Amino acid sequence: EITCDPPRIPNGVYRPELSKYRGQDKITYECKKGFFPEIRGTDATCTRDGWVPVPRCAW
């Protein structure tokens, strides 16, 4: 009965866009031209500790 709020990814775009996500629900994200992700992958799963790994678009 784990739930997540939509991820907050400044300078990036995630999919799908839903009001609420359930445990093990995966989002995929892309960064704006000029920005690159913190991790190699563009995946994030809804867990007890939020979105894992944390989605971040860096310059």
Partner: protein, 213 residues
């Protein structure tokens, strides 16, 4: 779910936009080729018109009044052909300029929309959503009109609350205007190429009575 209906509506919007962005560079290249062709034809009409004016002027030396009027007419057509070639230079320069603008736009977003679809292909909520995104991997739109570009941008912006979708709409609106101006500039090069041909022909007809060099 209605969550699956949402995600399917969203995946379709990404797919529509991605297909237009892959078509834009192919479209700009056809326009760039067309402008180059139109310009070179206007330069061939001007070169030929100049030759005719020279054949008429040499021919009318010590000629009658209804022979000297011909050279004056072939000279005026040779300059009209030249002036139209100059207008085709300026119009083709605009084609290259709007094509460049549209190419920067496609470059800014194509890899983003393609990556979002790749994510939906691998991790889509349904096998329908994964199937739609997998089919859209290399798909290209049949055409791109300024109205199709903005419609798909407004559709995306209505489905995605993320700032990215709003910034895409703002940019797609600028690109729809640049695409409209790319088509006006292509028509202007073609119009001037036709204008130069008509003048070349008027110079060649008046010079028909005189000897070639």
């Amino acid at each position: 779910n209605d969550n699956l209906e949402a995600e399917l509506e969203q995946t379709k919007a990404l797919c529509e936009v991605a297909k237009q962005l892959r078509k834009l560079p192919l479209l700009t290249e056809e326009r760039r080729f067309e402008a180059v062709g139109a310009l070179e034809e206007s330069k061939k009409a001007a070169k030929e018109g100049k030759k005719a004016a020279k054949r008429a002027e040499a021919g009318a030396v010590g000629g009658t009044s209804e022979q000297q009027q011909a050279a004056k007419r072939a000279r005026e057509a040779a300059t009209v052909a030249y002036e139209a070639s100059v207008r085709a230079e300026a119009a083709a320069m605009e084609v290259k300029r709007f094509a460049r603008a549209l190419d920067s736009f496609e470059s800014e977003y194509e890899s983003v929309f393609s990556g979002l679809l790749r994510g939906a292909a691998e991790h889509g909520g349904n096998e329908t959503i994964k199937q739609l995104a997998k089919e859209c991997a290399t798909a290209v739109a049949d055409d791109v009109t300024p109205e199709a570009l903005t419609r798909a941008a407004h559709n995306l912006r209505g489905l995605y609350m993320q700032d990215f979708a709003e910034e895409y709409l703002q940019e797609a609106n600028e690109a729809a205007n640049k695409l409209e101006e790319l088509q006006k500039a292509t028509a202007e090069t073609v119009r001037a190429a036709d204008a130069a041909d008509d003048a070349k022909s008027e110079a060649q007809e008046e010079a028909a009575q005189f000897p070639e060099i």
